[PDB]
Design a binder for this molecule. Structure first.
Ligand code: HEM
Ligand code: HEM
Ligand code: HEM
Ligand code: HEM
Ligand SMILES: [K+]
Ligand SMILES: [K+]
Lengths: 154, 155, 154, 155, 154, 154, 155
């Protein structure tokens, strides 16, 4: 296994671990506030990052690397709905930047299978960006209070 | 063979349908992009409905030994926000129904009653779309834009 | 969204829009002639291009570009079965050349998700080339009239 | 009670249907005799369809208090091979659709919109038969007679 | 919500976050080595701790505290099966010690619902200790190689 | 059809044809010895290579090349379980090296569909490497005799 | 355990199966590439049948404590067109049946009746393939090449 591939994979893994915890707390904060539709959607975002982390961990071990679950970077926790969505978007913008750099290196050393894995993750993070920009746009179009009312009931 | 002006009329209606297919499809995907899923879904079905009308016109023209024209695409009326998109669709349908009425007058004149019947059914369907569009613009007036948009976020 | 990526996506979208109308007209001409197997197969080629156009429109909008459904290029309409098939093949060869150029650029600017979308379109257009070259070969092997007889009934 | 000329027109269309019923039924059984079962089955359903139009005309005539004429049977156009039988069918239908258009014109003139509608349904059906006939004749040109016949041996 | 209760709950939550990652890595390590029965059981232990973390997080927010998902303590990662089992046991002995001290304080300030939450977690951690002590005892009774062989197949 | 792409595809095909026979004979040798679990797994590995060979043959023909099913290279046949596993691994390490070289060339000439096929085969061969290294690892962890015993029954 | 010449005969028959597997698989995929899908599907099943024969020989060789030979691959008889591919298959089957008869003779001689019974089963399957092949070549003679090909386009 290419040593820099493993470093890149461990970097993506670290990003997934931030997102898991950030989205899970954001989910439970929205549930606490009675914004149950946002809570449920954000729960699922968290679960999806868990599954990516699993796939990264499996690949690192196959390549005889050591998965790093010890290092947890900075959680971006907002204190209201609009900040929380922006915090999620900031984290995903960093995530996709790291994914593209990892893919470049995989291509260079011909680790095409690792590249394929990261690209699938990358498509999933861009779908999350799509959702997030759409939510932030809806807040601008209908206003904050109507956006929140629309996410009360599941 | 077909009456030459009937075939010209049929190709004109076909050209209108081809505009509407593309206009509604883009508007539909714009509304999905914005997270206005109820509008996106409804507008997708309007696009499909115009595709089916275009199919029937193509089939009729070929039966009449005419040449269907799928090459000349007229001007799409693409709006930049929900209220503009609805008015753009409405303007397109007012032109559409005017052309359908003139086509029906000519078919009647030359006794092409089957083409007339085809066009009358397309006409009823475009008037149903006009009903929808006038109702949507009327609702924007009665409840306001933001509430109208909120009501179209969720399918 | 990268500016040339959006231009390439709009170019492929333009090719899809030509194919949709070309295949649809070819389909209904074959039905008009009583060659129902050709008409049905060609109808499904048109539908398949409609679904590719849809995905391209969606990706362009996500990248904050403007989908161009206004410019309709030159339809290659044949006068008989053999010309219709060759017209379809001419269109597909142009289409795949454009797809390869779009993929090269996506790879260059690290738009791997757009690359993946175009590669899936590309595989579908190569399957259509396989079908078309096979049909033209059968016309040579069994002759035109037997080929047409084999396509009267669905 | 009904308009005198409308009833005359309806009886004329009825007479055209009575010819087609008998012509198509004989052509069907001839194709079956020859082992061209696909043609024989299709032609059988053409005959049945004309029977149904005949019934609807009879019922309308009786409602309008006219006398349906089933006694006068015009000239059957019988072919002696497949290409002739198809062209004979096509010649009959070209005459039938001409008569249908003239009847619709007169129904419209005297405001018998229900009779016009019945005739317009028949006309659409006969244009569909014309579509079929012209396509078959076109196929004989495109693939040749013997292959055309072969394609019509099995149902 | 009582301030020291929230501190205790956040301490127990911190123990759960360690256990999640430790058990998840050990599970994927066992799968990597072909010890699928151990890998499957350890995966389930990880999921169980995830669910406890969820309930802790919900309770903290109901009590108007701030759940801490940022501070990840030291993972005890073994290098072979016998060490991994011992690391899990060491972790659970620390977890139940902290659980007991959290329950003492809840009782003292009459937060009987938090006490009940913690007692349910405690029973599940004591079930895990029963499992661990039993596995270590089986290594002693049958030997390490038979123990491993018995955990190859699910 | 690019000429060196075809040569690369025929080279990968040649590797598949070796693996088909090597794995089939290994399967039947394990069945003859009563190591039925190994026999079944190796039969499925052989069938998987048969399917990759079919896809490669179909692609070569579409690209108007001549599939070469006449040149069969050297089968690596072991005479006990541990040698047969190592023979399979040696063959797959050679296979994956050739696959990466074929992908490099396909990327160079913009044959992205062929690259995508070859990348799917590579993922499957890396899964086989994972299986093979895991088996060799188990033999070291539990011993050869326990490993063989665990593979008597399906 | 097994007679040494029996094992040589079984390895020879196995070598013939390995040629047929590859030859029929390639011919199958050639016919699919050409759109002759009925021939491609039939030829595929012939390849799979030879694969199963090869498996039974391998198993019998190992039971007899022989070494199955999957390394030596003889000459594939690949044709350039349908007529040649069919004849290439037939030429391979005439050599295969000749070798099967010689193997059966030797099995009978040394009282390896279970090996004879295996080879006899394979022989019957190879004669069914000869029956198929001679029938196809005869049909090409009776209806003409192009009609034979047309009959094998659709599955
Ligand atoms: C921008 C151009 C177009 C787009 C994006 C588009 C898109 C689509 C889509 C997504 C479908 C559904 C396919 C499926 O999921 O099965 C569809 C169906 C269909 N399209 Fe189009 N289309 C376009 C143009 C046309 C045109 C120009 C015609 C005919 C002249 C046409 C005729 C049809 C028909 C007949 C159907 C089947 C409708 C039904 O019965 O459900 N389309 N189209
Ligand atoms: C005034 C002339 C005729 C009229 C109004 C008439 C009317 C009808 C009608 C309404 C049906 C039932 C159709 C359905 O609902 O599917 C029918 C069936 C049929 N007709 Fe006629 N018909 C006429 C003459 C003939 C003639 C001249 C023949 C043969 C030479 C014929 C042969 C048949 C046959 C075989 C059936 C199907 C009966 C069964 O097996 O159920 N008809 N007809
Ligand atoms: C704050 C830390 C975490 C929390 C609160 C959490 C929470 C949860 C919850 C509540 C579930 C649903 C369990 C059920 O009831 O079925 C779940 C599932 C799961 N978790 Fe976590 N989790 C965390 C971290 C992780 C990590 C770090 C990983 C892997 C590296 C992970 C991997 C998984 C997987 C693979 C599933 C099953 C997903 C599926 O296939 O549906 N989790 N988690
Ligand atoms: C020693 C040579 C080979 C042997 C003994 C062998 C044996 C077998 C057997 C026993 C089966 C299962 C058949 C059944 O029970 O239905 C099979 C399936 C198959 N074989 Fe082979 N085979 C060989 C070589 C090949 C080659 C060279 C190819 C293609 C290039 C091939 C292509 C296939 C395919 C496509 C299947 C079906 C796989 C599926 O979809 O399940 N085989 N083979
Ligand atoms: K509201
Ligand atoms: K024929």
């Amino acid at each position: 296994g290419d040593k820099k591939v493993i470093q890149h994979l461990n970097k993506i893994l670290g990003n997934e671990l931030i997102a898991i915890n950030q989205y899970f707390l954001h989910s439970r904060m929205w549930n606490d506030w009675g914004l149950k539709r946002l809570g449920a959607h954000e729960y699922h975002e968290s679960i999806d990052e868990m599954k990516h982390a699993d796939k990264l961990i499996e690949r690192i071990l196959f390549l005889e690397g050591l998965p790093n679950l010890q290092d947890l970077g900075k959680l971006l926790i907002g204190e209201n709905t609009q900040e929380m969505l922006q915090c999620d978007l900031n984290l995903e913008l960093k995530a996709t930047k790291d994914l593209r750099e990892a893919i470049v290196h995989c291509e260079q050393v011909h680790d095409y299978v690792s590249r394929d894995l990261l690209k699938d993750i990358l498509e999933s993070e861009e779908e999350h960006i799509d959702y997030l920009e759409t939510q932030l746009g809806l807040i601008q179009k209908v206003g904050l209070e109507l956006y929140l009312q629309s996410h009360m009931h599941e």
